[PDB]
Scaffold this active site. Structure first.
Site, PDB file in Angstrom:
ATOM      1  N   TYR A  17     -11.070  -3.385   2.564  1.00  0.00           N
ATOM      2  CA  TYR A  17     -10.303  -2.782   3.567  1.00  0.00           C
ATOM      3  C   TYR A  17     -11.259  -3.049   4.814  1.00  0.00           C
ATOM      4  O   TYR A  17     -12.397  -2.239   4.904  1.00  0.00           O
ATOM      5  CB  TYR A  17     -10.053  -1.422   3.274  1.00  0.00           C
ATOM      6  N   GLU A  60       1.032  -1.236  -0.065  1.00  0.00           N
ATOM      7  CA  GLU A  60       0.111  -0.075   0.095  1.00  0.00           C
ATOM      8  C   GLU A  60       0.872   1.345  -0.124  1.00  0.00           C
ATOM      9  O   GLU A  60       1.896   1.560   0.980  1.00  0.00           O
ATOM     10  CB  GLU A  60      -0.837  -0.167   1.200  1.00  0.00           C
ATOM     11  N   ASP A  80      -4.935  10.446   8.559  1.00  0.00           N
ATOM     12  CA  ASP A  80      -3.577  10.129   9.057  1.00  0.00           C
ATOM     13  C   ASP A  80      -3.282  10.771  10.291  1.00  0.00           C
ATOM     14  O   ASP A  80      -3.659  11.990  10.490  1.00  0.00           O
ATOM     15  CB  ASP A  80      -2.492  10.414   8.092  1.00  0.00           C
TER      16      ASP A  80
HETATM   17  O1  LIG Z   1      -0.833   1.157  10.769  1.00  0.00           O
HETATM   18  P1  LIG Z   1      -1.422   2.302  10.560  1.00  0.00           P
HETATM   19  O2  LIG Z   1      -2.444   2.561  11.933  1.00  0.00           O
HETATM   20  O3  LIG Z   1      -0.606   3.480  10.297  1.00  0.00           O
HETATM   21  O4  LIG Z   1      -2.651   2.381   9.421  1.00  0.00           O
HETATM   22  C1  LIG Z   1      -1.947   2.227   8.053  1.00  0.00           C
HETATM   23  C2  LIG Z   1      -3.008   2.572   7.130  1.00  0.00           C
HETATM   24  N1  LIG Z   1      -2.501   3.077   5.664  1.00  0.00           N
HETATM   25  S1  LIG Z   1      -3.520   2.665   4.640  1.00  0.00           S
HETATM   26  O5  LIG Z   1      -2.888   3.190   3.365  1.00  0.00           O
HETATM   27  O6  LIG Z   1      -3.914   1.010   4.777  1.00  0.00           O
HETATM   28  C3  LIG Z   1      -5.180   3.437   4.885  1.00  0.00           C
HETATM   29  C4  LIG Z   1      -6.102   2.998   4.602  1.00  0.00           C
HETATM   30  C5  LIG Z   1      -7.369   3.923   4.763  1.00  0.00           C
HETATM   31  C6  LIG Z   1      -7.309   5.176   5.195  1.00  0.00           C
HETATM   32  O7  LIG Z   1      -8.374   6.021   5.676  1.00  0.00           O
HETATM   33  C7  LIG Z   1      -9.592   5.766   5.520  1.00  0.00           C
HETATM   34  F1  LIG Z   1      -9.918   4.493   6.268  1.00  0.00           F
HETATM   35  F2  LIG Z   1     -10.450   6.569   5.656  1.00  0.00           F
HETATM   36  F3  LIG Z   1      -9.707   5.187   4.063  1.00  0.00           F
HETATM   37  C8  LIG Z   1      -6.148   5.727   5.544  1.00  0.00           C
HETATM   38  C9  LIG Z   1      -4.896   4.866   5.317  1.00  0.00           C
END
Ligand SMILES: O=P(O)(O)OCCNS(=O)(=O)c1ccc(OC(F)(F)F)cc1
Ligand SMILES: Cc1ncc(COP(=O)(O)O)c(C/N=C(\CNc2ccccc2O)C(=O)O)c1O
Ligand SMILES: Cc1ncc(COP(=O)(O)O)c(C/N=C(\CNc2ccccc2O)C(=O)O)c1O
Ligand SMILES: O=P(O)(O)OCCNS(=O)(=O)c1ccc(OC(F)(F)F)cc1
Ligand SMILES: [Cl-]
Ligand SMILES: [Cl-]
Ligand SMILES: [Cl-]
Ligand SMILES: [Cl-]
Ligand SMILES: [Cl-]
Ligand SMILES: [Cl-]
Ligand SMILES: [Cl-]
Ligand SMILES: [Cl-]
Ligand SMILES: [Cl-]
Ligand SMILES: [Cl-]
Ligand SMILES: [Cl-]
Ligand SMILES: [Cl-]
Ligand SMILES: [Cl-]
Ligand SMILES: [Cl-]
Ligand SMILES: [Cl-]
Ligand SMILES: [Cl-]
Ligand SMILES: [Cl-]
Ligand SMILES: [Cl-]
Ligand SMILES: [Cl-]
Ligand SMILES: [Cl-]
Ligand SMILES: [Cl-]
Ligand SMILES: [Cl-]
Ligand SMILES: [Cl-]
Ligand SMILES: [Cl-]
Ligand SMILES: [Cl-]
Ligand SMILES: [Cl-]
Ligand SMILES: [Cl-]
Ligand SMILES: [Cl-]
Ligand SMILES: [Cl-]
Ligand SMILES: [Cl-]
Ligand SMILES: [Cl-]
Ligand SMILES: [Cl-]
Ligand SMILES: [Cs+]
Ligand SMILES: [Cs+]
Ligand SMILES: [Cs+]
Ligand SMILES: [Cs+]
Ligand SMILES: [Cs+]
Ligand SMILES: [Cs+]
Lengths: 395, 268, 395, 268
Positions: free
Chosen positions: D175, D49, D60
């Site tokens: 997801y 990703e 984030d």
């Molecule tokens: O391990 P962490 O807590 O840093 O999470 C990593 C996530 N990275 S990602 O690209 O999957 C990701 C997936 C979804 C996100 O927002 C949403 F849910 F609103 F769509 C943001 C980042």
């Protein structure tokens, strides 16, 4: 010779240098004339409504009386343009100044609220305004100094004496005694020589009139008591006036107790002074054994004055009104309480009135009582002072 | 007594006007004040006007404000001022002594008692700066009961009613105000006062002394030429005290020369 | 699926992470329910009148239009409790928060006016309030930080990005996305995801309603134009809403021109940006060629935002409303002019609207025009900023 | 292509879950980012990703906020990110590559054009963080037209309607959000997600990857044991970058060991 009675019982009169008597007589005549003049009244009404924002709200405060049989309303003079009740009578006196052909205004200020009101009215109505303010008050109420200067008023620091309100009053009077042909003295309280205590009451009485109408509408009866702080007497007499003949209604005025009456550092001459002659009037004074005028003290610059208007002294003497005191600490608690539980930031002056109302409630919590506090101003000017106090306390 | 009456009769015979200095009692201290006052008299003062230190002298400008402050710094009280007045009268039996008072100091322990004390120490007149005619009744009554002349102010803005009242009620002298404003040598009076002087004479008022802003011999002559019976000078005198605080000897020398010059101006 | 239309033409929508959609749907449902609920309406009305001080004055300003054929009225939102129009909709949203069983409030602020309004409403109504404020805005609008803390709100400085309003918005949204079960996001403008632009308009529309009634009473006709500054869009849409169907009435919104549009240091996306997706909405954005959101700039913290509410973008697109800009210097002149000639100290935000009205007058002085400026707030918070500017100019 | 489909079929045969790291493209620079990504793959990442630096990444938390900032400090643009994606795909023909996008970057130069560019460089999926299902139509349509899997979020607060929609509209993977809030290793998800996993399977959704707060091998195993097809970890990985900025060698060593350990946890 006067048109109106200069005395309230033994108190009041016109104790100024002879030079100033024509000015006082002219002012009295203009007031009597204006009070009968529908055009003056309509202009005054117009300014109060459309410029100043009258009528002001009457707010029922629920949180701070929870668990008691007190119902407490606040008359919201803090919402008036300028941020205090001072604006009401300044509009009327500015119109009198114009009626008399004066082009200049002299005013004293302590809290800066009267200074700001004088400056804003002068800007609107085309008068050249100079303000005397004690150097101590310049610092502790500085937001107001900024405001006055932006509106084109001249602000003159006074370093003499205590460098507070008394000293500013002294300078304003000295100035007027040599400029009265062109300058009107816009005295900021219901004190000083006749006709000021009378004029200031009549130009503040809408406070009580509105309160009465509002309380009747909401509660179907008069208040058990109305409560106001007393610096020189204007907001209190404005609240009281329309209730004087309603004998069931308590009139309670709150003088500053400062560090405590027993310390001598207070501003409570009505209850802890004695009758004297100063600032144009026979009235209770903080004075030495020898007859020198003392310096007052209050955390609140607007109450830091060692005398009081004569109608209050009179109403006290006959037992129609009762006067009490509230210390710096009591006022600070009331300030904090209103901010946190009603979301209203009151002037430290008005906080003295609130503190007494809260004491009335807390001391007798099962006493049924309908109370109105005159919330004479907003506390924006005090936020820095209060911060510094609470910081030094480790709060 | 009749100290003013005797003075003005003597002055009229010598075809001259009075020169009357003002100082604050106890400025800059009791002992130096007493010496200052002796110097004023020795130099030719016809009468004295003497201020009792007051916390809030609202008819006074900075010079005399500062005189009041100096007296207070030396711890001077009304009681000590009365002690001084007794010592002055003891040395100088004939000179008219007028007090400049503010109302609260007269009212403080009772109006009648105040005037009684003035009489005891040998004061001749009392002027209460913040009491207009309109409020004067208990003051003037108490003054007359104790053989004290009540001094009334005739301002430049005086109408006919006021002239008549001041003429009737007053004794000793009539105070003829030079100008609006407060005491001070920096502002000289701009109005001609001849019309008021004539009216006072017609209504049989006490003789007029002009005061406020008189700081030069020329102004003394002009007051007398204008028909006044003399002139009072305060701030000009007090300025000499203030300038010479550190040299009491040069203070007295300068006061002597000034008073001498001012008095000489009253001779024509 | 929504109950109400989330779009104004192409603009608006609900561009938030999926996690937040139930919160938006719940808010929309509660709003629709509340709008039909006489008890909610009565409670809201009660707070507006008796707590906040509505209706606000409409002031005719005579001095500043002398010698021209402009008649200018100011709608006095500066007299509302709290000192700005922000108070109106905060009272409504706080009641919605309670209706939804939320015990906590999150708010962003720039000028601190929304922060103060959020804090005061939370104190009154029993909510635990946390405010995000850019560190730059903390300094330039500090009077407001004092006020918020005294009323028991938590104030959280934001150092990220420009350390201004945008950054505070970002933090507030991040917070809400992890606390929405217990916290209501009290968004402070007519922007963000549906239903906020709709709710904020409906809870501000009394501004225009009162204005219309007041103008009719005083002038017997509608205004030629109503004029308001545009930060995110709330005070302007509150003024505009009731006039939208009166096609003769000009609707003029004033974006901040900052140091001048040509410098790129401004906050005028509606006229100088381009449509993008950020802060939950499809709306004009200040953005780079690459689609990164820019930082805005204005002397006025309350207008320092690089986007704008979608109903404004829509009203512009169809030509119903016109949008202009006013620079820092133009706003400062209008500020000075009102202080000195009307005795009213306006917020620097509101000063942008005033500046445009003065330009309308000055450019065509013999044009007959009846104008209303929404005087969205008082300038107490700005007096220190303005002092420092005028001092550096040697004024 | 069918990169996800092939991956999950292979994984299912080995009875294992996917481990999918997240990093920001170009953090802390382009060259180091490319090396980091090669290390993630060499250490056993099943898919990537990859975030494109965005000015305002509102989903984030601080760790990934700071990743974005570092990339911007190195001057990284979307255009340079596409160049990087081409280089990554050129080295690694089979690994599924998913982008984490914010809406404005997709909308900026036209939605269709964005997806067309993704297809050109060999990206397999796009997740647009601030586009909910309700707004997804033009995004998902453009994705499918260009053979890109549109990634939908199944939050813990998902109702049945949302499960059905996500199941129907999505491709590649579903997801599965651990928790409310924003990205970050400091907050671990507290809700059991087994009910959502079963419902997704019933509605024939793309296989589920759990993400947000996954920072330890135990959480990887738990996701797989709970029925998910694997787990995503972002902040935990990015923290290792942040900690080792001054030592690129120790950065890669630590990333290798971490990814190795996380991947091993997916094997049972
Ligand atoms: O391990 P962490 O807590 O840093 O999470 C990593 C996530 N990275 S990602 O690209 O999957 C990701 C997936 C979804 C996100 O927002 C949403 F849910 F609103 F769509 C943001 C980042
Ligand atoms: C909000 C508020 N609430 C109450 C008060 C108390 O004054 P009151 O209502 O007149 O008793 C003030 C007094 N403030 C002064 C003092 N004004 C003042 C006081 C005494 C003599 C001369 C003065 O100008 C000022 O100059 O503004 C105030 O600001
Ligand atoms: C007196 C006054 N007059 C006008 C405005 C302009 O805001 P408008 O009327 O909504 O366009 C403000 C805006 N002030 C902000 C910004 N508020 C804000 C702005 C943009 C996004 C989020 C916000 O909280 C605050 O936080 O108080 C103001 O205080
Ligand atoms: O020479 P200046 O200008 O200092 O004036 C000296 C005056 N000293 S005094 O005692 O006569 C004197 C006389 C009258 C005063 O006030 C009053 F008029 F209101 F009554 C004050 C002082
Ligand atoms: Cl009476
Ligand atoms: Cl009497
Ligand atoms: Cl008249
Ligand atoms: Cl009347
Ligand atoms: Cl200025
Ligand atoms: Cl001064
Ligand atoms: Cl009423
Ligand atoms: Cl009636
Ligand atoms: Cl009732
Ligand atoms: Cl009672
Ligand atoms: Cl009673
Ligand atoms: Cl008593
Ligand atoms: Cl008491
Ligand atoms: Cl003094
Ligand atoms: Cl001292
Ligand atoms: Cl003068
Ligand atoms: Cl629409
Ligand atoms: Cl659409
Ligand atoms: Cl509901
Ligand atoms: Cl409704
Ligand atoms: Cl606090
Ligand atoms: Cl933060
Ligand atoms: Cl109305
Ligand atoms: Cl209607
Ligand atoms: Cl009409
Ligand atoms: Cl029009
Ligand atoms: Cl039109
Ligand atoms: Cl455009
Ligand atoms: Cl423009
Ligand atoms: Cl950010
Ligand atoms: Cl930077
Ligand atoms: Cl969280
Ligand atoms: Cs109660
Ligand atoms: Cs007092
Ligand atoms: Cs006589
Ligand atoms: Cs006009
Ligand atoms: Cs803006
Ligand atoms: Cs599917």
């Amino acid at each position: 010779t006067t048109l109106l009675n200069p005395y309230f019982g033994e108190f009041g009169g016109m104790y100024v240098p002879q030079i100033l008597m024509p000015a006082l007589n002219q002012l009295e005549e203009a007031f009597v004339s204006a009070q009968k003049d529908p055009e003056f009244q309509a202009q005054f009404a117009d300014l109060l409504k459309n410029y100043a924002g009258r009528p002001t709200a009457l707010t029922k405060c629920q949180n701070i009386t929870a668990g008691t049989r007190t119902t407490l309303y606040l008359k919201r003079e803090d919402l008036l343009h300028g941020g205090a009740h001072k604006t009401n009578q300044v509009l009327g006196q500015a119109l009198l100044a114009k009626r008399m052909g004066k082009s200049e205004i002299i005013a004293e200020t302590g809290a800066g609220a009267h200074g700001v009101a004088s400056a804003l009215a002068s800007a609107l109505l085309g008068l050249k305004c100079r303000i005397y303010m004690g150097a101590k008050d310049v610092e502790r109420q500085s937001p107001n100094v900024f405001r006055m200067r932006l509106m084109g008023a001249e602000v003159i620091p006074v370093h003499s004496g205590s460098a507070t309100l008394k000293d500013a009053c002294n300078e304003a009077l000295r100035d007027w005694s040599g400029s009265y042909e062109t300058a009107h003295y816009m005295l900021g309280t219901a004190a000083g020589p006749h006709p000021y205590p009378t004029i200031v009451r009549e130009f503040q009485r809408m406070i009580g009139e509105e309160t009465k109408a509002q309380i009747l509408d909401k509660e179907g009866r008069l208040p058990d008591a109305v409560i106001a702080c007393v610096g020189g007497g204007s907001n209190a007499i404005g609240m009281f006036a329309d209730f004087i003949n309603d004998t069931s209604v308590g009139l309670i005025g709150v003088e500053p107790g400062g560090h405590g009456i027993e310390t001598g550092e207070h501003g409570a001459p009505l209850k802890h002074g004695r009758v004297g002659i100063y600032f144009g009037m026979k009235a209770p004074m903080m004075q030495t054994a020898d007859g020198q005028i003392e310096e007052s003290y209050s955390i609140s610059a607007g109450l830091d004055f060692p005398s009081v208007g004569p109608q209050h002294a009179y109403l006290n003497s006959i037992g129609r009104a009762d006067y009490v005191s509230i210390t710096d600490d009591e006022a600070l608690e009331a300030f904090k309480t209103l901010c946190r539980h009603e979301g209203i930031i009151p002037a430290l002056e008005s906080s003295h009135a609130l503190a007494h109302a809260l004491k009335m409630m807390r001391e007798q919590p099962e006493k049924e009582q309908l109370l109105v506090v005159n919330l004479s101003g907003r506390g924006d000017k005090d936020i820095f002072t209060v911060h510094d106090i609470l910081k030094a306390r480790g709060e | 007594m009749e100290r003013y009456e005797n003075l003005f009769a003597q002055l009229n015979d010598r075809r001259e006007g009075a020169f009357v200095p003002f100082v604050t009692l106890g400025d800059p201290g009791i002992e130096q004040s007493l010496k200052i006052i002796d110097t004023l008299i020795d130099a030719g003062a016809d009468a004295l006007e003497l201020g009792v230190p007051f916390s809030d002298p609202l008819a006074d400008g900075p010079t005399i404000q500062n005189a009041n402050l100096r007296a207070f710094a030396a711890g001077v009280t009304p009681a000590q001022c009365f002690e001084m007045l007794a010592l002055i009268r003891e040395k100088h039996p004939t000179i008219p002594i007028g007090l400049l008072m503010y109302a609260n100091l007269v009212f403080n322990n009772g109006i009648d008692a105040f005037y009684a004390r003035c009489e005891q120490v040998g004061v001749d007149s009392v002027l209460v700066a913040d009491v207009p005619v309109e409020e004067s009744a208990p003051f003037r009554q108490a003054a007359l009961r104790h053989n004290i002349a009540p001094i009334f102010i005739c301002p430049p803005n005086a109408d006919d009613d006021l002239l008549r009242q001041v003429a009737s009620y007053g004794r000793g002298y009539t105070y003829l105000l030079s100008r609006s404003g407060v005491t001070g040598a920096e502002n000289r009076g701009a109005l001609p006062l001849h019309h008021l002087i004539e009216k006072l004479k017609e209504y049989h008022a006490a003789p007029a002394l002009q005061g406020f802003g008189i700081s030069s011999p020329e102004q003394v002559s002009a007051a007398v030429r204008a028909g006044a019976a003399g002139a009072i000078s305060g701030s000009a005198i007090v300025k000499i005290i203030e300038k010479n605080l550190a040299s009491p000897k040069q203070m007295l020398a300068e006061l002597r020369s000034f008073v001498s010059a001012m008095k000489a101006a009253s001779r024509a």
